[PDB]
Design a protein around this nucleic acid. Structure first.
Length: 67
RNA sequence: GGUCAAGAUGGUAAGGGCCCACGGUGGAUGCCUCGGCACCCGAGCCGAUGAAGGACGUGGCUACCUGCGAUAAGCCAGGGG
Protein backbone atom coordinates (compact mmCIF):
# COMPACT_ATOMS: atom_id res chain seq x y z
CA UNK A 1 0.00 0.00 0.00
CA UNK A 2 2.41 2.66 -1.18
CA UNK A 3 -0.92 4.53 -1.18
CA UNK A 4 -0.97 4.06 2.55
CA UNK A 5 2.52 5.60 2.43
CA UNK A 6 0.50 8.50 1.10
CA UNK A 7 -2.29 8.74 3.75
CA UNK A 8 0.66 8.67 6.04
CA UNK A 9 2.20 11.61 4.40
CA UNK A 10 -1.27 13.17 5.01
CA UNK A 11 -2.10 12.95 8.74
CA UNK A 12 -0.37 14.63 11.78
CA UNK A 13 -0.52 14.96 15.66
CA UNK A 14 -3.60 13.47 17.34
CA UNK A 15 -4.37 12.11 13.87
CA UNK A 16 -1.55 9.67 13.31
CA UNK A 17 -1.93 9.24 17.04
CA UNK A 18 -5.34 7.63 17.17
CA UNK A 19 -4.81 6.23 13.64
CA UNK A 20 -1.96 3.98 14.61
CA UNK A 21 -3.61 3.39 17.96
CA UNK A 22 -6.92 2.15 16.52
CA UNK A 23 -5.18 0.28 13.74
CA UNK A 24 -3.05 -1.34 16.43
CA UNK A 25 -6.24 -2.33 18.22
CA UNK A 26 -7.23 -3.85 14.82
CA UNK A 27 -4.19 -6.09 14.84
CA UNK A 28 -5.20 -6.93 18.41
CA UNK A 29 -8.40 -8.15 16.80
CA UNK A 30 -6.01 -10.37 14.87
CA UNK A 31 -4.29 -11.60 18.06
CA UNK A 32 -7.76 -12.64 19.12
CA UNK A 33 -8.23 -14.37 15.80
CA UNK A 34 -5.33 -16.66 16.70
CA UNK A 35 -7.71 -19.66 16.37
CA UNK A 36 -10.67 -18.64 14.12
CA UNK A 37 -10.68 -17.47 10.48
CA UNK A 38 -6.90 -17.74 10.28
CA UNK A 39 -6.21 -18.84 6.70
CA UNK A 40 -6.74 -15.55 4.78
CA UNK A 41 -5.87 -13.72 8.02
CA UNK A 42 -2.15 -14.42 7.72
CA UNK A 43 -1.66 -11.18 5.89
CA UNK A 44 -3.82 -9.02 8.12
CA UNK A 45 -1.21 -9.97 10.68
CA UNK A 46 2.11 -9.57 8.83
CA UNK A 47 1.15 -6.64 6.70
CA UNK A 48 -0.94 -4.87 9.34
CA UNK A 49 2.10 -4.98 11.56
CA UNK A 50 4.31 -3.60 8.77
CA UNK A 51 1.66 -0.87 8.27
CA UNK A 52 1.44 0.34 11.84
CA UNK A 53 5.24 0.12 11.86
CA UNK A 54 5.21 2.66 9.09
CA UNK A 55 2.74 4.72 11.22
CA UNK A 56 5.49 4.99 13.73
CA UNK A 57 8.26 5.61 11.15
CA UNK A 58 6.21 8.65 10.25
CA UNK A 59 5.31 10.02 13.62
CA UNK A 60 9.05 9.93 14.06
CA UNK A 61 9.73 11.70 10.84
CA UNK A 62 7.20 14.51 11.62
CA UNK A 63 7.57 15.33 15.25
CA UNK A 64 11.30 14.65 14.82
CA UNK A 65 11.31 17.36 12.15
CA UNK A 66 9.71 19.35 14.96
CA UNK A 67 12.03 18.87 17.94
C1' G B 1 29.74 -123.78 2.80
C1' G B 2 30.17 -123.94 8.19
C1' U B 3 32.86 -123.93 12.99
C1' C B 4 37.55 -122.17 15.70
C1' A B 5 43.10 -120.35 16.38
C1' A B 6 46.19 -116.67 14.29
C1' G B 7 47.70 -112.08 11.70
C1' A B 8 47.03 -107.42 9.27
C1' U B 9 44.48 -103.39 8.23
C1' G B 10 39.01 -99.71 7.86
C1' G B 11 35.41 -96.38 8.13
C1' U B 12 32.83 -94.41 11.95
C1' A B 13 33.53 -86.45 15.10
C1' A B 14 31.23 -83.79 20.14
C1' G B 15 34.96 -80.15 18.64
C1' G B 16 39.42 -78.73 16.76
C1' G B 17 43.74 -77.70 12.88
C1' C B 18 45.58 -75.66 7.22
C1' C B 19 42.89 -74.56 2.55
C1' C B 20 38.29 -72.34 -0.70
C1' A B 21 33.54 -70.21 -1.21
C1' C B 22 30.04 -67.01 0.60
C1' G B 23 28.25 -63.14 4.76
C1' G B 24 28.33 -59.83 9.13
C1' U B 25 30.33 -56.25 12.67
C1' G B 26 35.14 -52.43 11.85
C1' G B 27 36.46 -48.39 8.87
C1' A B 28 41.41 -48.31 6.38
C1' U B 29 40.52 -45.16 2.69
C1' G B 30 41.30 -43.36 -3.33
C1' C B 31 39.43 -39.39 -4.35
C1' C B 32 36.56 -35.31 -3.14
C1' U B 33 35.00 -30.21 -0.64
C1' C B 34 31.20 -23.75 0.87
C1' G B 35 37.75 -25.49 6.01
C1' G B 36 42.43 -24.47 7.56
C1' C B 37 47.34 -22.80 7.19
C1' A B 38 51.55 -19.73 4.69
C1' C B 39 53.20 -15.17 2.02
C1' C B 40 52.40 -10.95 -0.13
C1' C B 41 48.98 -6.21 -1.01
C1' G B 42 44.75 -4.09 0.57
C1' A B 43 42.88 -2.34 5.33
C1' G B 44 43.57 -0.31 10.76
C1' C B 45 40.45 2.38 14.97
C1' C B 46 35.02 0.91 18.73
C1' G B 47 32.55 3.66 23.01
C1' A B 48 27.91 6.78 26.43
C1' U B 49 23.79 9.63 19.54
C1' G B 50 25.55 4.42 26.92
C1' A B 51 30.10 0.43 22.21
C1' A B 52 32.73 -4.04 22.04
C1' G B 53 29.95 -8.08 24.51
C1' G B 54 25.42 -10.78 26.09
C1' A B 55 20.14 -11.80 28.95
C1' C B 56 14.83 -12.38 27.75
C1' G B 57 11.81 -11.50 22.59
C1' U B 58 9.35 -11.90 17.06
C1' G B 59 8.64 -14.42 12.67
C1' G B 60 0.12 -17.61 11.07
C1' C B 61 1.56 -22.27 12.66
C1' U B 62 8.54 -22.47 15.01
C1' A B 63 13.22 -25.84 20.62
C1' C B 64 16.78 -24.57 17.05
C1' C B 65 21.07 -21.80 13.11
C1' U B 66 19.43 -16.01 11.01
C1' G B 67 18.19 -11.16 11.27
C1' C B 68 15.87 -7.64 13.80
C1' G B 69 13.62 -6.05 19.14
C1' A B 70 8.39 -4.02 21.27
C1' U B 71 7.11 -0.21 15.07
C1' A B 72 11.46 -7.43 16.08
C1' A B 73 10.84 -13.50 8.23
C1' G B 74 11.91 -6.34 9.63
C1' C B 75 9.11 0.61 8.50
C1' C B 76 11.91 5.18 5.61
C1' A B 77 14.42 7.72 1.93
C1' G B 78 17.93 7.84 -1.92
C1' G B 79 21.78 4.76 -4.78
C1' G B 80 21.52 -0.41 -7.72
C1' G B 81 18.02 -4.21 -10.72
Amino acid sequence: MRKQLEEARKLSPVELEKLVREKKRELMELRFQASIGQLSQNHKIRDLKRQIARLLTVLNEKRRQNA
